[PDB]
Amino acid sequence: MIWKYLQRTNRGNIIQAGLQHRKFENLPFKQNFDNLTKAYDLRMWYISNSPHEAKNLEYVNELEALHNELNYQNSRQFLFRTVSFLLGWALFYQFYELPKTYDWQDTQEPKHQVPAYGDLEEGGDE
Amino acid sequence: EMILPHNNRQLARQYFDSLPENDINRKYYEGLKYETPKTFFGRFLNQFNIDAKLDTLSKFYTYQKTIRATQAELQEDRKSYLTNSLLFTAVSWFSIYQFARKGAVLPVLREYGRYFGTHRLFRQYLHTLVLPLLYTEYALNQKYYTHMEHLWTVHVNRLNQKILEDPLYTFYPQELNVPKHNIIVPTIFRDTPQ
Amino acid sequence: AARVRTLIAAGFSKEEAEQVAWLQNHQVNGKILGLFTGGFALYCCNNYFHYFERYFPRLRYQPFTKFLAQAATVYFFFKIGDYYFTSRRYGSNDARMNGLMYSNTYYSTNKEALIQNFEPLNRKFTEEEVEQFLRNEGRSQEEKRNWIYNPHIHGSTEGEWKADIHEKFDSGKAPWEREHVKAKILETNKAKIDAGEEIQLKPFKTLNHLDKTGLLHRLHPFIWTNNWTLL
Amino acid sequence: GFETVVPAPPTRDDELRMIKATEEQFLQQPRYKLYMNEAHRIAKMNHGDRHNNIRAHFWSNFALGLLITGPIFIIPFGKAFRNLRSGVPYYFRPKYVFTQKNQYNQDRNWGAMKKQIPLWLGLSTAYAYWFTDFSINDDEWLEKGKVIYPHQTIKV
Amino acid sequence: VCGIYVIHVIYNYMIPYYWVSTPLKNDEFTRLRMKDYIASTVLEEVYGISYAEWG
Amino acid sequence: VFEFLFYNQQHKTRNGYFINHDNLMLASLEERKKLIFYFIANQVPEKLDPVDRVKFNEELSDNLSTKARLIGSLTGLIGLVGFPYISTRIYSRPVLNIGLSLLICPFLYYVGNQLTYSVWEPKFIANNNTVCELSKKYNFTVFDFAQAKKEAHLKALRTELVSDNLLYSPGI
Amino acid sequence: DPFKKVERDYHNERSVHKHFASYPLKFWWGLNKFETIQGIHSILGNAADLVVSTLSFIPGVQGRNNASYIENSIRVTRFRGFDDKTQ
Amino acid sequence: SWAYMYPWLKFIFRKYLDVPYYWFYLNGRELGIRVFFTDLKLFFYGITNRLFDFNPSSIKFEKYPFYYWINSSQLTEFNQYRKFVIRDSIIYSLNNYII
Amino acid sequence: RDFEYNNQDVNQLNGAFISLVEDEKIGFWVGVGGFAYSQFIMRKFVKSTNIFASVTSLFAGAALANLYTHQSRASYARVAARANRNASLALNKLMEY
Amino acid sequence: MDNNYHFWGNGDRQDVSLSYEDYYSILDCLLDEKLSPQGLMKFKNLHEVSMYGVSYVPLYCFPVAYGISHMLTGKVRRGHSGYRNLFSLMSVVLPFTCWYAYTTPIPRRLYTEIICSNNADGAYVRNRIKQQKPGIWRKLSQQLYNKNFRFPELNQDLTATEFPLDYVAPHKF
Asked: What residue ranges are annotated as transmembrane (chain D) (predicted)?
């Protein structure tokens, strides 16, 4: 019976998957990033798998328009997220008790601070 | 540190010598074991003895480093928490008064209470005055209850063994400290026979 | 079939664990062979149980009787295996047929030697024995230890101390073989001797009475599987 | 850290016996066991034997983990490549080379394999390191580095 | 040929040099002896004597 | 492969037979002495003087050894409710009912005995004044515990060895 | 007489202590081999300990002390090293 | 701008550089990948403990000067740096000043 | 004096024992909850005798408790087994004559 | 529960946990003169395991930082095209993820045997951490007292006649 679970392969693993229709049934009444990405991916898959030409070229033009719109949406997302990240970084370092209590031994080299070989580097003995 | 036995002013012993014969500390000196309350309610009733235990230790161990640090930390935390509670109460009262002057009243409690029929505004003022104090007491009691429980366990343990000297980190004032002898005449130099 | 690892989990050396494992293996393997032969017979003679419905019609009309008969046959083969392995079945100590289980001589002799010669310590180790055990740490190596005498840590004199440590460590004498230890053991366990109970001095050594090969009992090994000759 | 009794210097017979033991131990060495004549030769050969035992166990466990981890982990992992986040079926998004994914499921299969084979080997390696006992050669206090001699190995 | 020689130099001159960098409590002399042996006993500097009648 | 059926299994999970060095590896000195004395007294009573053997046996019977048997008997009686399980006007099945009772009642006895031990044995070891007194009196060591473990395992093996021929042991 | 059962008697140390009738009646003790039965026993013991504590509010009965190493160790190591092969 | 973190760069790889050859038989340990996976598991356990287990409190005394300048006593075993006797004297003087 | 157990074994056993005790408490509560849930489910939807329902509920609760506690129990079992083996070997070496 | 429970660099769930940073700080308050050869061996094994671990820690933090950096850029996967922003945000965030990882205590048998040992080496290590690393010893003692460890150096000692050297955090009695 082991073969029935090892040799046999799930149908979905072999055949091309269809649409996840649940993601196209209830859509928000917005031109938001999610709907724009869904439309972009639909048109891209169509032009990747369809043998027709006029519809494919219409979808190419609409895909360029969607690329511009999605670039605008990504610009807004990037601006908001990065500004929030920088502000949170600054506020964290304002409210963080920065530890100014680390060992300073690295800044001290007495043998070099007071030259141990006093004048002995300036000519030998005899 | 270690105050030498001949240099050890047994100040604790002095305070133990002035203690009344009925004082529980003397009972500890006789071997009265002290066990931390392990029952919730008991711990509750033990959370109000923090200041009494701290005062007893301060009289016993006035110059112990840990005892002095505990006193200073408890005093500063009490002052800071009291100031925070009073500022929160002042802000709450000011906000409630200024918003109620323009009709706005926060609907947290019932408009008219049971029994006496006090108003929502009055009960809000009372709650904003009382509850911050309760939370301040709760937090201070938690922290310094564990700390003072450990300190008092140590105190009772060292009383049971009749140890009336001063602890390892007692720093006396300058009037109770031995001055250092500066004059140290080195031994006369002498050629070694060998 | 006694899980030598588990035996070492209890107080047991590797060799003693092997011997006890072999003994329990003999027992349980006899019983297991009996069960497997019994289970194999039912796999083939369950039609025999249906065949005997003419001499014993109770089997046909009372199916529970058939189940009881099958269980009885299973137990019968179980007992046959148990007898063939866990019974005495005394046989000659001969080299031509030892090992081959025409007799149960190996298991019987090992079981008898274990049961006869096994007795608990009947006491507790004295402080002199316990201190000796703590001083027996890794000093039983092949290279004998060089014993150096220090008067300030050993006391006594060199002549007395050298013979003392020779008896304690080098001679191989066990702590319970010392006169002082025996006297203290007799004194401490006086109550026990007040009951007429003898006190064991030597802790029971399993390796002196159990042997898979049977060389302790001078059992001649199987001649065709052994190059050497015993006794 | 006590000392042992230092024996007297060996006689000619003892020297000959230890010479014979060293000869036998030298003859026991295989030709493919390339260990030079050194004081640590026997210790290194024992270490190599233990390492070979550990290696055999590790590779058996690695093959077993390749057998096990796939259908449990990697094959269901492929189920994550049937569709995209937006729900549209998987298609090809090129990076630079616009490869002609003309075959049936070429794009999905190649993307899934690129994500799976590294994951497959990584999970199999984690399994092999998890279920292999390295206690054969491990020495916490490095007491196995003691020099062992050929004449000590064999008694004549 | 250069790279095989360079690899041979890297094998016994650089990496061994990076091994011991601090004073050692146990068998420091033996460790330094190993480090120096793998670098100072190269046949290129010792092999000439076997064929000395040439020169 | 059925050693759990035809071998002795009742002594393994009670009377401290499970106590091993791991326990003593974490116990305090007094707790270690208590555990070692309990194991020795339960498994190898030969190491104690007869008076102490009798005292410990009495205490063990009062707390664990006999209380467990009583509670197992109570559970068996619970299993005896309606002993003619399968009976009617026409037929009462004697062999069937007897087999059902002899399979149910010992199982419930075992369940009750195991429950009693699992509940009261740790409390008996920890909080028995007689056990504490005798452990302080004897002060067995780790060597004593190891020797007693060997003796206990050998005695448990001996119990099965002697009971190998219960039907015909001529001795030849 | 309890003393008669503690006397050191050679014969008493090598005689049959478990006869045939004791083998079926005690054969159920091998179920401890199974971790499922061990878990059943652990659950029953812990429930009984909870009951014993709740009724140990009554004087004269002592509940389980969770700070006692001996109690905890015995409770959690009763089935620590079970092995049906041995003995 | 990351140039002056080269001591951090050296640290890890300078530790790596001092690992001797395996078959020179100095320790016989090559615990790279083993430590990789073991520390992966250890970090899983550590994060789980830091999230859903006991975490030590960081509360400390904040208002007593030089409180954590602890001078040697019987509680500290006197195994400090030898020339810290001057430090102990300074600590004693500072405490006698602040009492 | 007395025999001293190896300190590393003591520390490992201490950790394993702490884990075992904590998981034993949590797993007892898990087993009680699993028994209750199995009994509820079997009374709601399964049509069988109360004896069968109760035995199945008890077995399900025990199985859930063991599943929760298996890691700690097995880790402690192996740590204790190795500690006992090491201690037994050391003591047998000391006491062998 | 791995098969290699004997490994010194390994550990169980309830072993003594030390964050890498703390470990390195612990190395700043010790001397090899005061330690026995066995303690030195323990510290050498810990050093080997710790150097490998601190090498591997950023890698463990890479997937988390990689995910966080992408989420900061937005909901667009510009692989090979958003590399500039992705890796700038990584050079920011990966230090933070590694900060969290390095400040997170991890169990280890070497940690539990170096600190919690009865011998003079362990006593010396505990006393040095107590005196020269007050906060590290404070949190370590809070951790140890919850693991059924009783030492004279712990601040949570109820059998001591000398007052604790540091604040005692709340805990169950």
From this structure: 58-77
User: Can you give the three-state secondary structure of chain F, one letter per residue?
Assistant: CCHHHHCCCCCCCCCCCCCCHHHHHHCCHHHHHHHHHHHHHHHCHHHCCHHHHHHHHHHHHHHHHHHHHHHHHHHHHHHCCCCCCCECCCCECHHHHHHHHHHHHHHHHHHHHHHHHHHHHHHHHHCCHHHHHHHHHHCCCHHHHHHHHHHHHHHHHHHHHHCCCCCCCCCC
Q: Do H27 and D129 touch (CB under 8 A)?
A: no
Q: Which of A33, A78, A103 sits opposite J73 (nearest CB)?
A: A78
Return d(Cα B35, Cα G32) in angstroms, integer.
Answer: 42
Cβ burial G33-61 (10 Å sphere, 16+ → b, else e): bebebbbbbbbbbbbbbeebeeeeeeeee
Chains C and A are in contact, defined as 3 or more C-beta pairs closer than 8 angstroms: no
Torsion angles phi and psi, residue B62, rounded to 5: -55, -30
Q: What's the half-sphere exposure (Cβ side, CA atoms, 13 Å) at F157?
A: 30
Quote the CA–CA distance of I72 and I30 in Å, as a whole number.
15
Interface subset of B 138-177, CB within 8 angstroms of H: 143, 168-169, 171-174, 177
Question: Chain F window 11-30: which residues touch I at a Cβ cutoff of 8 Å?
Answer: 20-22, 24-26
CA distances from B4 to B181, H62, H87, I61 (A): 16, 30, 19, 65
The secondary structure element, H or E, covering residue C219 is none
Q: Which residues contact C112 (CB under 8 A, 6 or more apart)?
A: none
Pair of tokens at residue G15: 């005689």
Q: What would the two tokens of residue F87 be?
A: 């009976």
Is the distance from CB of J57 to CB of J101 less than 8 angstroms?
A: yes
Reported as half-sphere exposure (CB side, CA atoms, 13 A), residue I57 has a value of 20
Give D89's strand partners.
D83
C-alpha I95/C-alpha I97 separation (Å) is 6
Closest by CA to J127, choosing from J31, J15, J44, is: J31
Tokens, residue C36? 């497997």
Residue in B148, B165, B128 with CA at minimum distance from that of residue B14? B165
Whether A34 contacts A69, CB under 8 Å: no
Three-class secondary structure of residue G85 per DSSP:
coil
Q: After which residues is the backbone of chain B broken at C–N > 2.5 Å?
A: none
Contact I77 G39 (CB under 8 A): no
Torsion of CA I83, I85, I87, I89, to 10 degrees: -160
Chains meeting G at 3+ CB pairs closer than 8 A?
Answer: C, F, I
Which among E54, D108, C177, G74 is positioned nearest to F121, based on CA atoms?
A: G74
* Rounded Cα distance, F160 and F147, in Å: 21
Sequence-ordered list of residues with C-beta below 8 angstroms from that of D81, at least 6 positions apart, any chain: D90, D108, D111, D112, D115
The DSSP result for D64-101, as a single string, is HHHHHHIIIIIHHHHGGGSB-TTSSBP----SS-----
Do residue I5 and residue F21 have CB atoms under 8 angstroms apart?
yes
Report the amino acid identity of residue C59: L
Tally of CB atoms within 10 A around A17:
18
User: What 3-state class would DSSP assign to A42?
Assistant: helix
Element (H, E) at J106: strand J106-107
Contact yes or no for C113/C135 (Cβ under 8 A):
no
Q: Which residues of C touch D5 (CB under 8 A)?
A: 143-146
Residue A97: CB partners within 8 Å, gap ≥ 6? none
The experimental method, as deposited, was cryo-EM
Q: Does J152 lie at the interface with H, CB-CB under 8 angstroms? A: yes
Closest residue in C to F46 (Cα) is C122
DSSP3 helix / strand / coil % (chain I, rounded to 5): 85, 0, 15
Contacts of C213 (CB under 8 A, 6+ apart): C219, C221
Distance CA F35, CA G77 (A): 13
